[PDB]
Amino acid sequence: GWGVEAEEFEDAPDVEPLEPTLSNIIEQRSLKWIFVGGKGGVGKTTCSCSLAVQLSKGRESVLIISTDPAHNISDAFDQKFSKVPTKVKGYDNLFAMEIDPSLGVAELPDNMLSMGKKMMQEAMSAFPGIDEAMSYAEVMRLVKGMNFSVVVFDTAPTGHTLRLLNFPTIVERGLGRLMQIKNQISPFISQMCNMLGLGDMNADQLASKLEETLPVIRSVSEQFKDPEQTTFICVCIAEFLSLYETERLIQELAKCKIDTHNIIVNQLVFPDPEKPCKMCEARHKIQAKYLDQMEDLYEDFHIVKLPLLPHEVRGADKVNTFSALLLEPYKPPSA
Amino acid sequence: LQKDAEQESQMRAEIQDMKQELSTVNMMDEFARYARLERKINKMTDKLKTHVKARTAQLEHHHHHH
């Protein structure tokens, strides 16, 4: 208000293209939610795993949540995983898990109360948007009560990741439907129990289930909009369709006020004078065209480049290799 | 003869000029120009839509009085 514009004093520094690394992620000690999305398959999964490995060195404990329907995370680490997080081989801090596409909340984490729960879940089925958000909320409540220093999401290349990023909004809007479903199931539960089973205790259950999870949901909502605590990382390849979907994703992230400032372009081919390949030269021509378009348009991002690894490279070693190329830019193959 | 009308007319005219320019851009060859222009269009459209919804709320306040 009273301060000088501060641009009078020393003119303006010149635009420096940001460093093609993810070190800005590491130095952000405040980050507790890191999403890794975009349209990618094995590359996106391996990138998220390499990010976790590098994060574990400077952090206290790191988690890996994979909502990708394909179980490529278990493949890459050379170790299988499941909903219960297990320690990764050779690392004390790393922990990882694999959530189902249905989020594994089909069974929530007497028999009359079980029937009432089954009635609730079945009625919620008729609203897949709200039910999906509730399953997101149960998962986030478990991971928050787990109390880890930072979590990395290997998200799905579909729009369900966008739903996950707006799950508190979906829950807040779906409160009316939830109360309606509760208001239609509770009297049947109470009537059935009293009239035929004497006990009325089952009616009191599920009352305080929504009285303490909601503050957690509101805190997560306030936490996602914070750039210091939440950031999105986009994975793509240097082709037109990938660039188009990337721009669409960034635009929808801006709409949701979810921050993103790191892009990963993988499967990049670099022609080598040794072992020539003409189709690699043509693919490089196309990649060069759209990577120039990216470096022009995305000057406000850290554009980390990753080369197409030879097909033989697999498992923890390609993870180890990527774990370095995300902090040191790859060197050209010109001997 | 009100500012909220003049503002909408100017915003709609500028959005239309931007859309006319975007029809010239090739999305594949000059993607950065296409994207930056589409971002400006979407921002100005969201601003116009918020202004229109505010005036619609004023109309509902008068037409269907509280």
Residue numbers in the entry:
A (entry chain A): 7 to 115, 122 to 347
B (entry chain B): 39 to 104
Task: Copy the relevant paper text.
Within the membrane targeting stages of the GET pathway, the homodimeric ATPase Get3 (also called TRC40 in metazoans) adopts closed and open conformations in response to nucleotide load and interactions with other pathway components, allowing binding and release of the TA protein respectively. However, the cryo-EM structures and native mass spectrometry of hsGet1/Get2 and scGet1/Get2 show they form a 2:2 heterotetramer, which is stabilised by Get3 and interfacial lipid binding and is important for efficient TA protein insertion.
As the Get3 TABD helices α4 and α5 are not resolved in the hsGet2ΔN/Δα3’-Get1/Get3 cryo-EM structure, we bound E. coli purified hsGet3 to the hsGet1-CD in the absence of nucleotide and solved the crystal structure of this complex to 2.8 Å resolution. There are otherwise only minor rearrangements of structural elements found at the dimer interface within the hsGet2ΔN-Get1/Get3 cryo-EM structures, indicating the hsGet3 fold is independent of oligomeric state. In the crystal structure, the hsGet1-CD contacts the hsGet3 monomer via the more extensive interface I rather than the smaller interface II (classified previously for scGet3/Get1-CD complexes). Therefore, the hsGet3 TABD can adopt either state 1 or state 2, with the latter correlated with interactions with helix α3’ and/or the hsGet1-CD via interface II.
